[PDB]
Amino acid sequence: GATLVDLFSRAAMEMPDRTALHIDDEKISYGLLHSWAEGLADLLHDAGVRKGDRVALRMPPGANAIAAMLGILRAGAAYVPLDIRNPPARNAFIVTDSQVVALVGDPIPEYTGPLVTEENVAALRPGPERPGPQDVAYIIYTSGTTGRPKGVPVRHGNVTALFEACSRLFSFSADDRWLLFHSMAFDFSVWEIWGALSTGAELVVLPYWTARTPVETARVVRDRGITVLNQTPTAFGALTTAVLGEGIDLPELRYVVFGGEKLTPAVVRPWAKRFGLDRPHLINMYGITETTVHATFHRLTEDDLAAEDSVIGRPLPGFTHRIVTEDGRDAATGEPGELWLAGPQVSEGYLNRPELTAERFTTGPPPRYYHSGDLVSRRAGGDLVYQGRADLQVKLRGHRIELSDVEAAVRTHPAVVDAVVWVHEFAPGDSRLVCAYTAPDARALRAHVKTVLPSYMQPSQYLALPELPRTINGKADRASVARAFDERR
Ligand SMILES: Nc1ncnc2c1ncn2[C@@H]1O[C@H](COP(=O)(O)OP(=O)(O)OP(=O)(O)O)[C@@H](O)[C@H]1O
Numbered sequence: 001g002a003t004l005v006d007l008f009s010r011a012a013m014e015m016p017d018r019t020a021l022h023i024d025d026e027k028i029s030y031g032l033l034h035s036w037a038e039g040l041a042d043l044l045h046d047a048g049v050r051k052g053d054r055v056a057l058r059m060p061p062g063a064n065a066i067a068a069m070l071g072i073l074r075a076g077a078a079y080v081p082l083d084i085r086n087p088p089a090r091n092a093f094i095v096t097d098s099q100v101v102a103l104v105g106d107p108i109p110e111y112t113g114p115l116v117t118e119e120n121v122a123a124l125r126p127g128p129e130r131p132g133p134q135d136v137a138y139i140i141y142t143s144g145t146t147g148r149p150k151g152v153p154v155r156h157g158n159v160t161a162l163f164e165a166c167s168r169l170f171s172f173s174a175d176d177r178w179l180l181f182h183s184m185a186f187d188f189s190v191w192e193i194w195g196a197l198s199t200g201a202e203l204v205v206l207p208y209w210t211a212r213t214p215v216e217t218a219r220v221v222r223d224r225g226i227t228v229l230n231q232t233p234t235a236f237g238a239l240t241t242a243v244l245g246e247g248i249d250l251p252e253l254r255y256v257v258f259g260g261e262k263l264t265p266a267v268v269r270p271w272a273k274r275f276g277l278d279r280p281h282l283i284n285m286y287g288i289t290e291t292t293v294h295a296t297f298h299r300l301t302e303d304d305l306a307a308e309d310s311v312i313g314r315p316l317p318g319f320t321h322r323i324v325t326e327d328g329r330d331a332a333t334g335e336p337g338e339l340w341l342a343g344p345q346v347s348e349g350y351l352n353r354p355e356l357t358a359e360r361f362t363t364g365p366p367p368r369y370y371h372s373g374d375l376v377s378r379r380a381g382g383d384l385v386y387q388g389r390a391d392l393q394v395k396l397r398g399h400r401i402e403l404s405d406v407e408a409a410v411r412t413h414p415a416v417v418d419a420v421v422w423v424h425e426f427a428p429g430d431s432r433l434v435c436a437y438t439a440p441d442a443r444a445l446r447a448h449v450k451t452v453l454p455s456y457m458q459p460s461q462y463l464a465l466p467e468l469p470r471t472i473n474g475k476a477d478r479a480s481v482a483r484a485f486d487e488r489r
């Protein structure tokens with residue numbers, strides 16, 4: 001149907017006996033989740049929540065968080081998720097920037113808006129007016145690199161267009177088990193949640209436990225019988241180490257879907273020798289929050305493991321696209337350019353960032369294009385290959401540097417897991433190439449990199465970290481690495 005509410009309604013009306021949520025040994029049926037959610041919506045209505053309103057959600061992953069989010073959607077409102085490892089100042093900003101009429105869960109400088117507590121939500125375990133396709137389902141905040149975190153509001157019709165685009169490339173059924181691996185404040189959780197709840201499938205909630213190892217994660221994945229696993233490449237590399245080390249088998253896995261980072265063939269090779277490429281399928285998906293979770297699809301093949309190219313494949317069925325030169329021109333085959341995207345999954349622009357919206361969402365004088373700020377090429381055969389972020393193609397003292405190439409060159413060192421390379425302003429006068437990396441001292445690393453890279457591309461300073469700092473989506477927080485570096489210097 002038109003909305004996420006419709007999707008849940010259909011599946012719940014039609015498969016009420018099936019398990020919607022699985023939290024350790026706890027199982028909630030679609031039927032009972034549906035009941036709980038209708039009740040929560042009525043409760044939200046009573047507290048003065050209206051269609052088009054925005055409600056904060058702040059809860060650990062579990063039954064209550066999910067039921068609250070359905071209740072919020074059923075009430076015609078958008079949920080604005082706050083991840084609880086988010087620093088208090090970040091919530092405080094989002095709470096005010098998004099102007100929520102209420103918060104669900106427990107809390108922040110001002111509490112003066114109304115609360116629905118977790119205990120309140122647990123208690124409820126024709127209705128308010130239903131939302132339309134053009135109503136906002138969620139508002140997820142992305143990283144603003146200097147300037148503030150920015151909010152992206154995604155509509156019901158945006159999300160429902162996502163699952164329609166994917167209907168024929170994936171083979172999903174009510175029998176699947178989806179893992180909720182990701183933060184509810186990361187849009188990859190939307191795919192995970194609604195992947196399950198739109199089809200009658202089961203959603204396995206990874207309960208919140210920070211001392212859980214990859215090894216434990218692997219063990220749950222086998223034991224809870226997961227068929228659809230979503231991972232960032234960073235997460236999957238560590239998962240693979242654990243699966244291979246303990247020798248875990250995963251015969252029930254049907255799909256592993258990658259998103260959110262550049263997926264290198266090297267990351268995938270160890271997996272592929274153990275399980276092959278036929279089961280599960282490996283699917284790389286390029287995506288951005290501004291165009292609703294995923295924008296492309298590429299099933300991995302043996303060929304992708306021969307070269308070192310990052311194939312992201314073709315735009316999802318809903319999309320039209322451009323590959324654009326610095327000049328505004330359409331790029332030739334094999335030529336790198338900026339990817340632009342148009343279609344029903346593209347968001348309506350940022351929240352309260354009117355000038356940024358103006359720049360990155362454009363209409364000719366024609367489709368409405370979102371400028372991804374990502375560099376890609378169309379290879380012969382029509383597949384997209386991902387090159388890198390225009391952000392990270394920088395210039396320094398007369399040379400152009402692919403920061404991402406330096407990074408990979410540092411990663412080429414066998415004892416190095418991860419690297420972040422950037423231009424650091426030591427002073428206005430002194431701008432130099434810097435690297436942070438995780439496990440080899442700087443001396444050995446520096447000596448190795450002098451092999452791989454031209455001299456202008458060699459990091460001027462190396463900082464060894466126990467781990468790289470992480471935003472809640474599990475990516476390396478670049479602004480956090482630069483600040484840690486600066487303070488250690
Ligand atoms: N399959 C992929 N291969 C390569 N890069 C990817 C892939 N999927 C996502 N990315 C990168 O991740 C980004 C999408 O991230 P998201 O929408 O969460 O915001 P962000 O890039 O983390 O920050 P912002 O929204 O502030 O630009 C894209 O800019 C792209 O560079």
Ligand SMILES: C[C@@H](O)[C@H](N)C(=O)O
Pocket residue numbers: 187188259260261285286287288289292293294473
């Ligand atoms: C799933 C992944 O592509 C997510 N939308 C991100 O933008 O980081």
Ligand SMILES: [Mg+2]
Pocket residue numbers: 288372373
């Ligand atoms: Mg981006």
